[PDB]
Amino acid sequence: TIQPGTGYNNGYFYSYWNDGHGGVTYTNGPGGQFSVNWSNSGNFVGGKGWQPGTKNKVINFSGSYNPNGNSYLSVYGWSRNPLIEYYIVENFGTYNPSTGATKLGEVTSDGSVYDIYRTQRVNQPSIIGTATFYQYWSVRRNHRSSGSVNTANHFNAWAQQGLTLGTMDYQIVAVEGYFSSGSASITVS
């Protein structure tokens, strides 16, 4: 069980961040496993993966995801020059994270249609401090708690919609929570 921060555990990069509100217990397990149990948390995001990620990685994940309020399970990562924060949402509860974003199109990948969106984050935290950057989204219509994600399908779809990606920074499978409660246990590979 660790506090917010980044590092490596059992061959995988991990990142855990929260807004200072408590109620969150994030734990790194064997291999690419991590578990997060939260009770009336604030905003937080945590998970395991790679540093840096690639633009053709096939990511596998499996586990249990039981949110009770705003939350989502997704491939989460960044790129620099251009600075981009992206998500390939596999499951979520109560609130579709793409809400308010502009829809650019759709893509059919790994057994489901995903809705593609783009939105701008103004003066928000990021891997390089406070900044303004674009956020790309691929939201799976058929929610699931395990499977494989061919990241290339989404990056290529985004590129088709004119959404360029810079040099990859971290790339993980993360569980997010936003003023809610819930539990999750995920193994990444």
From Swiss-Prot:
Q: Which residues are glycosylated?
A: 37, 60
Cite the pH-dependence comment: Optimum pH is 4.5-5.5. Stable from pH 3.0 to 8.5 at room temperature and from pH 4.0 to 7.5 at 40 degrees Celsius.
Could you name the active-site residues? Answer: 85 (nucleophile), 176 (proton donor)
User: What Gene Ontology biological process does one annotation of this record name?
Assistant: xylan catabolic process
**Highest taxon of the lineage:** Eukaryota
Give GO terms: molecular function aspect only. endo-1,4-beta-xylanase activity
Provide the residue positions that the database annotates as binding substrate. 72, 76, 87, 121, 125, 135, 170
Which reactions fall under this protein's catalytic activity?
Answer: Endohydrolysis of (1->4)-beta-D-xylosidic linkages in xylans
Q: What is its EC number?
A: 3.2.1.8
Boundaries of every GH11 domain copy: 1-188
Induction is noted as: Induced by D-xylose, dependent on the cellulase and xylanase regulator xyr1. Repressed by glucose through negative regulation by the crabon catabolite repressor cre1.
User: Which pathway does this chain act in?
Assistant: Glycan degradation; xylan degradation
Q: Can you say where in the cell this protein is located? A: Secreted
Keyword line: Carbohydrate metabolism, Glycoprotein, Glycosidase, Hydrolase, Polysaccharide degradation, Pyrrolidone carboxylic acid, Secreted, Signal, Xylan degradation
This protein's GO cellular component annotations are:
extracellular region
Task: State the family named in the UniProt similarity comment for this chain.
Answer: Belongs to the glycosyl hydrolase 11 (cellulase G) family.
- Role summary: Glycoside hydrolase involved in the hydrolysis of xylan, a major plant cell wall hemicellulose made up of 1,4-beta-linked D-xylopyranose residues. Catalyzes the endohydrolysis of the main-chain 1,4-beta-glycosidic bonds connecting the xylose subunits yielding various xylooligosaccharides and xylose. The catalysis proceeds by a double-displacement reaction mechanism with a putative covalent glycosyl-enzyme intermediate, with retention of the anomeric configuration. Produces xylobiose and xylose as the main degradation products.
Protein name listed in UniProt: Endo-1,4-beta-xylanase 2
Query: Organism, per UniProt?
Result: Hypocrea jecorina (strain ATCC 56765 / BCRC 32924 / NRRL 11460 / Rut C-30)
The gene for this chain is xyn2
Q: Which residues of the full protein are shown?
A: 35 to 223 of 223
